């Protein structure tokens, strides 16, 4: 069935971009999607985004800049401490200064640099570059 929906929503977004399509229609539809979209949009790695509110199936329509090369989620969703944020960013990711290791904290979704500033992590949700 449909399980782990978020990974899937990121995965569609990667295929779109590999093709170099203008936009994406996300069939999955959550608070999680929209807060993650807001984080993406502050960095300006995505463009403008629309949420239509339907209760048949909410849709998000996303503009692609093409600045996200790959974005996917974590297989265990294993937890991450504050000291440990760097360890996961070098280890897995090619990034070093791109500043998104997206993590969920008690406030919503944060990036890497944003997690340091607050001082709070949680469970590691995903990554973006």
């Amino acid at each position: 069935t449909l399980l782990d929906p978020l990974a899937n929503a990121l995965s569609h977004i990667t295929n779109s971009e590999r093709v170099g399509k203008r936009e994406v229609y996300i069939k999955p539809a959550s608070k999680l999607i929209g807060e993650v979209l807001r984080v993406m949009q502050k960095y300006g790695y995505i463009g403008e985004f629309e949420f239509i509110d339907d209760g048949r199936a909410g849709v998000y329509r996303v503009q692609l800049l093409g600045r996200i090369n790959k974005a996917g989620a974590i297989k265990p969703r294993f937890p991450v401490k504050v000291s440990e944020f760097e360890k996961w960013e070098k280890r897995f990711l090619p990034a070093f200064e791109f500043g998104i290791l997206i993590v969920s904290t008690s406030q919503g979704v944060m990036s890497h640099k944003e997690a340091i500033e607050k001082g709070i992590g949680g469970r590691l949700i995903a990554y973006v570059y």
């Binding site: 297989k75 265990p76 969703r77 294993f78």
Partner: protein, 145 residues
């Protein structure tokens, strides 16, 4: 995936998968058991002395040629039969029967051997506790016996 227990508390499943498949290496299974120890006649030791039962020679295989000088030994260490390859140039003068001969492994326990030998895994370093290898060389001690 195409496979795995990736869940949070699934990890015991994954850990067992790996544990069974690790046994598929012979070299891992041998060493943990003591099968290595038991099988080799020196008993996991670098060398053992024994008495030369008789001088036999062994035939070369099909690629190759050459009739190799050899000793069949009975270890004084245990009470087992070993086949041990004796080098030497004109080898047989240096080597001597019914004296005490000391045998070592060679080349690891890879199980393989050279081509000139049908299956000999062993070396004779020493005869009466003075090396054969000194007698091969002209620069330490020139032929004796």
């Amino acid at each position: 995936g195409k496979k795995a227990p990736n869940g949070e508390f699934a990890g015991r499943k994954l850990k067992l998968k790996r544990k069974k498949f690790r046994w598929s290496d012979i070299r891992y299974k041998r060493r943990v058991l003591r099968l290595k120890e038991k099988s080799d006649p020196l008993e996991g030791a670098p060398q053992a002395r024994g008495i030369v039962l008789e001088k036999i020679a062994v035939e070369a295989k099909q690629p190759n040629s050459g009739m190799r000088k050899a000793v069949r030994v009975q270890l004084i260490k245990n009470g087992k039969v070993v086949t041990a390859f004796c080098p030497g140039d004109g080898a047989i003068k240096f080597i001597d029967e019914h004296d005490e001969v000391i045998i070592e492994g060679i080349g690891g326990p890879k199980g393989g051997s050279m081509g000139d030998i049908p299956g000999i895994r062993y070396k004779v370093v020493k005869v009466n506790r003075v090396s054969l290898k000194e007698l091969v060389k002209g620069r330490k001690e020139k032929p004796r016996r």
